[PDB]
Amino acid sequence: CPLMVKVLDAVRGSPAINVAVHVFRKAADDTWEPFASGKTSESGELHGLTTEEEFVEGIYKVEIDTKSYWKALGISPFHEHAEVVFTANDSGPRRYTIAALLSPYSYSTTAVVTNP
Amino acid sequence: CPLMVKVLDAVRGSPAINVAVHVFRKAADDTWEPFASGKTSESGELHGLTTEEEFVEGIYKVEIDTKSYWKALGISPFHEHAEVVFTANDSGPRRYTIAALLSPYSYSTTAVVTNP
Amino acid sequence: CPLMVKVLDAVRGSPAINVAVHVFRKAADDTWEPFASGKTSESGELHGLTTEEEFVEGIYKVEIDTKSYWKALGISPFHEHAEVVFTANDSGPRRYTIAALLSPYSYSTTAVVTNP
Amino acid sequence: CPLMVKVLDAVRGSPAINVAVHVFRKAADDTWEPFASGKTSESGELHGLTTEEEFVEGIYKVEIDTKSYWKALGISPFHEHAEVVFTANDSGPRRYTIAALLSPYSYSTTAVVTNP
Numbered sequence: 001c002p003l004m005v006k007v008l009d010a011v012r013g014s015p016a017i018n019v020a021v022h023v024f025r026k027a028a029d030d031t032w033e034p035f036a037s038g039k040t041s042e043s044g045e046l047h048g049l050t051t052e053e054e055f056v057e058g059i060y061k062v063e064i065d066t067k068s069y070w071k072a073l074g075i076s077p078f079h080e081h082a083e084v085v086f087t088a089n090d091s092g093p094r095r096y097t098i099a100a101l102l103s104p105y106s107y108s109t110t111a112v113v114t115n116p
Numbered sequence: 117c118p119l120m121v122k123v124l125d126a127v128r129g130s131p132a133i134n135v136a137v138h139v140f141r142k143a144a145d146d147t148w149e150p151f152a153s154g155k156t157s158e159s160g161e162l163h164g165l166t167t168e169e170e171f172v173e174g175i176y177k178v179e180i181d182t183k184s185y186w187k188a189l190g191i192s193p194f195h196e197h198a199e200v201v202f203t204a205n206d207s208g209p210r211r212y213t214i215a216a217l218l219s220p221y222s223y224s225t226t227a228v229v230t231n232p
Numbered sequence: 233c234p235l236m237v238k239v240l241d242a243v244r245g246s247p248a249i250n251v252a253v254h255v256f257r258k259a260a261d262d263t264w265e266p267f268a269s270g271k272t273s274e275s276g277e278l279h280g281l282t283t284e285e286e287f288v289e290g291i292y293k294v295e296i297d298t299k300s301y302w303k304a305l306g307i308s309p310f311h312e313h314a315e316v317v318f319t320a321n322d323s324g325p326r327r328y329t330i331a332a333l334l335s336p337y338s339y340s341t342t343a344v345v346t347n348p
Numbered sequence: 349c350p351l352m353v354k355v356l357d358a359v360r361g362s363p364a365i366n367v368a369v370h371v372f373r374k375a376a377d378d379t380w381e382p383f384a385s386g387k388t389s390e391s392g393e394l395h396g397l398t399t400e401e402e403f404v405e406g407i408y409k410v411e412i413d414t415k416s417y418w419k420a421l422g423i424s425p426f427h428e429h430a431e432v433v434f435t436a437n438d439s440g441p442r443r444y445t446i447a448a449l450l451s452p453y454s455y456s457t458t459a460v461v462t463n464p
C-alpha cells in the first residue's frame with residue numbers, strides 16, 4: 001500500500017476505531033487540494049487511500065480527526081486534529097505508514113518509509 | 117503569559133534552539149490569519165507571544181518549522197513542519213504551554229493547561 | 233500471539249531491526265525470573281516469545297535493549313534500555329502488543345491489549 | 349541541581365502532582381541501591397534529589413510510581429511503574445532533566461542534558 005494510516009488510543013490500550021482521516025496535497029497555487037479520505041477500521045488501520053499512479057510527488061497533509069474521535073466517546077479533548085505534513089516520493093515511489101497515538105491532551109506521530 | 121511554546125530535541129537530548137514558530141488564529145472565512153511568531157531561545161522556549169487581552173477564545177494553529185531546524189544541524193527530516201491546532205476555551209485553566217519533542221521521523225506534542 | 237513486541241526507529245523512519253528483547257516475570261520471592269527472550273525481525277517485530285499455557289498471570293518486565301541497538305549503529309545513546317512493567321492476564325488471558333519508538337535521547341511505549 | 353525529574357499527565361493536560369519517584373544507583377554486585385526519592389510538586393517537578401558531590405558517574409534508575417498516580421485519580425492503568433535507566437557520564441553536559449509524559453496505556457520519556 002503506498003499510504004497507510006494507523007491510529008492507537010493511549011487511554012484504552014486499543015486501536016482507535018472509526019477515526020476520520022483526510023489527506024490533502026499542495027497544489028501549484030499553494031492551496032491544499034483534497035486528495036483522499038477514509039475511516040480507520042476495527043484494527044485502527046486505514047488502507048486504500050490511494051494508488052501508486054495517483055500518489056505522485058508532492059507535499060501532503062494527513063489530517064487525523066482526533067477531536068471528532070474523542071467527542072464520539074464522550075470526551076472533550078484539547079486538539080482539533082493531528083496533522084502530519086511531509087514531502088512524498090521526491091526520490092521515486094516509497095511506501096508510507098503514518099502512525100499516531102492519541103491521548104486527550106497529547107499525540108505522538110511517526111512515519112515508516114520503505115522502498116519497494 | 118497565556119501562551120508558551122517549548123521545543124526539545126530527542127536526537128541531541130537538548131532544547132531545540134532557534135526554531136521558528138508561527139501562531140495563527142482561524143478567521144471567520146476559515147482562513148488562517150497570522151497572530152504571533154518568534155524563535156525559541158537557548159532553553160527551547162518561546163515566551164511573549166501574546167497577552168491576555170489579545171488571546172481570546174477561538175481556534176489557533178501553532179506551526180513549528182522543524183524542517184529548517186533539522187537542516188541547520190545537517191540532519192535529513194521527514195516533516196515539513198509540526199502543527200498543533202487547538203481551541204482556546206475560557207472555561208479551562210488560563211495558561212497554555214504547548215510542548216513538542218522532535219525526532220527526524222517523529223514528533224510528540226502535549227498541552228499543559230494550568231491556573232496561577 | 234499472546235505477547236508481541238514491535239520496535240520502530242524515529243531517526244531512520246524504519247523498523248528497528250535486530251533489537252534484543254528480554255522478558256522477566258516476578259517470582260514469589262520478588263526477584264525477576266528470566267521468562268523469554270528474542271530479537272526483532274526485519275519488520276521490527278518479535279513473535280513467538282511465549283505460549284498461552286506458559287503466559288500465566290503475573291507481573292512481567294519487557295526489557296528492550298536500546299543501548300545495544302544504537303551502539304551497533306555507531307551511536308552513543310542516553311538510556312541503557314527501555315522497560316515496560318505490567319501485570320498480565322489478571323482477568324484471564326489477553327493478547328498484548330508492546331510497541332516502542334526509539335530516539336537516541338528518548339523513547340515512547342504503548343500497549344495494545346485485546347481479548348481473544 | 350544535577351538531576352531533576354518532571355512528570356506530565358496527557359489525560360488531564362496538567363502536571364502530574366504528588367507522584368512518587370525513586371532513584372537507584374547500580375551497585376558493584378549489579379543490585380539497585382536506593383539513592384534518592386521524593387514526590388513531584390504542584391508543577392510536576394522534583395528538585396533537590398542529589399548534589400554534584402553525590403551524583404558520580406554510574407548507572408541510575410528512576411522509577412516513577414504511575415500506577416498509584418492513576419489509581420488516586422480513579423483511572424485504570426496498564427503499567428506498574430515507569431522506569432528510566434541511564435548512565436551518568438562526566439563528559440556530557442552537567443545537568444540532567446528526566447521528563448515523562450503519562451497516559452494510562454502509554455508513556456514517553458526524554459532526557460535534556462545541558463550545561464550552565
Ligand SMILES: O=C(O)C(F)(F)C(F)(F)C(F)(F)C(F)(F)C(F)(F)C(F)(F)C(F)(F)F
Nearest residue numbers: 122215216217224225226447448449456458
Ligand atoms: O521540559 C518541560 O517543561 C516539558 F514541557 F515538560 C517537556 F519536558 F518538554 C515535556 F513536555 F515533558 C516533553 F518532554 F516535551 C514531553 F515529555 F511531554 C514530550 F516529549 F512527551 C512531549 F513531546 F509530549 F512534549
Ligand SMILES: O=C(O)C(F)(F)C(F)(F)C(F)(F)C(F)(F)C(F)(F)C(F)(F)C(F)(F)F
Nearest residue numbers: 006099100101108110331332333340341342
Ligand atoms: O502497531 C503498530 O504497528 C503501530 F501502531 F504502528 C505502532 F508501531 F505501534 C506505532 F503506532 F507506531 C507505535 F509505535 F505504537 C506508536 F505510534 F505508538 C509509537 F511508536 F509512537 C510508540 F512509541 F508509542 F510506540
Ligand code: NA
Nearest residue numbers: 089090091092
Ligand atoms: Na526528485
Ligand code: NA
Nearest residue numbers: 321322323324
Ligand atoms: Na484475577
